């Protein structure tokens, strides 16, 4: 990946950490039943003025060593190529080739 895409990801994670509690509060108001029906409207109008990059759904998982956006595994934090390289070198405890 280019050096700009990784910077994009870092920025996204930072903003999403910054604005976590406010969004939870506003969404709780909107979702809860038996509200004033004006507080609901104001909360909807206020939830869309926060930065777009503060939503945790704008994030994409990338390989921690290369930045690849495809072929990602959650247990290891890497893509298939790097997983295989480390596994054959012997750097992932407990992992080995399987047959049955």
């Amino acid at each position: 990946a280019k050096q700009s895409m990784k910077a994009r990801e870092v920025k996204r994670v930072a903003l999403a950490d910054k604005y976590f509690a406010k969004r939870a509060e506003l969404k709780a108001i909107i979702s809860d039943v038996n509200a004033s029906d004006e507080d609901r409207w104001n909360a909807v109008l206020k939830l869309q003025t926060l930065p777009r990059d503060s939503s945790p759904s704008r994030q994409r998982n990338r390989c921690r060593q290369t930045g690849r956006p495809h072929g990602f595994l959650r247990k290891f934090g890497l893509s298939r190529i790097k997983v295989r390289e480390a596994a054959m070198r012997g750097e992932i405890p407990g992992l080995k080739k399987a047959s049955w």
Partner: protein
């Protein structure tokens, strides 16, 4: 065709692992990343000390690292002044208490990583590759190995068309899973491109 990795296929039968710790799913990835950074830093720092292996362990809430080398004096330095700096920087990277230990390699001519590094170093100073390969094979067979193989690939001598060459002596049975084979690789950066090197050493059946 293509060949399987000897070390990888032998893990658990006759070969040990290079890392030893237990973790759950929320620690695994971070542990791997920390190990990667530790190895990177050490390998950049100790490039003139003939390092061959870095083993990492994580007991309780600490990290302890063992370094396999053929020149322990250079690493230890004057009354530990260098090992101390290494320990401090490693503890900073890991984020937990750290410890460092040093182990000695008696015969550097029977170690696969060191042989490949020496061949690459020679290639970068404009030495003849046939000479380098033959010297490696002769040394290894003289100091007691039961067999060795060496392979080199790229633009050899400056040519325009790439090529691959290899030499062998003794026994090197690669389909036998109880055979003890040491295997490693290395790369050279020259004025015409990259050149690749592979080494196999056979020591007996266990």
């Amino acid at each position: 065709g293509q060949k399987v990795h000897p070390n990888g296929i032998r893990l658990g039968i006759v070969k040990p692992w290079n890392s030893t710790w237990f973790a759950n799913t929320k620690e695994f990835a971070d542990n791997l990343d920390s190990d990667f950074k530790v190895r990177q830093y050490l390998t950049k720092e100790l490039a003139k000390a003939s390092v061959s292996r870095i083993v990492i362990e994580r007991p309780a809430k600490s990290i302890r690292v063992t370094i396999h080398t053929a020149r322990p004096g250079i690493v230890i330095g004057k009354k530990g002044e260098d090992v101390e700096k290494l320990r401090k920087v490693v503890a900073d990277i890991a984020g937990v208490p750290a410890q460092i230990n040093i182990a000695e390699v008696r015969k550097p001519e029977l170690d696969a990583k060191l042989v490949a590094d020496s061949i690459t170093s020679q290639l970068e100073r404009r030495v003849m590759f046939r000479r380098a390969m033959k010297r490696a094979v002769q040394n290894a067979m003289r100091l007691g190995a039961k067999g060795i193989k060496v392979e080199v690939s790229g633009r050899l001598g400056g040519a325009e068309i790439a090529r691959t060459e290899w030499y062998r002596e003794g026994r090197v049975p690669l389909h036998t899973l109880r055979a003890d084979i040491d295997y490693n690789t290395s790369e050279a950066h020259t004025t015409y491109g990259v050149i690749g090197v592979k080494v196999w050493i056979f020591k007996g059946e266990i």
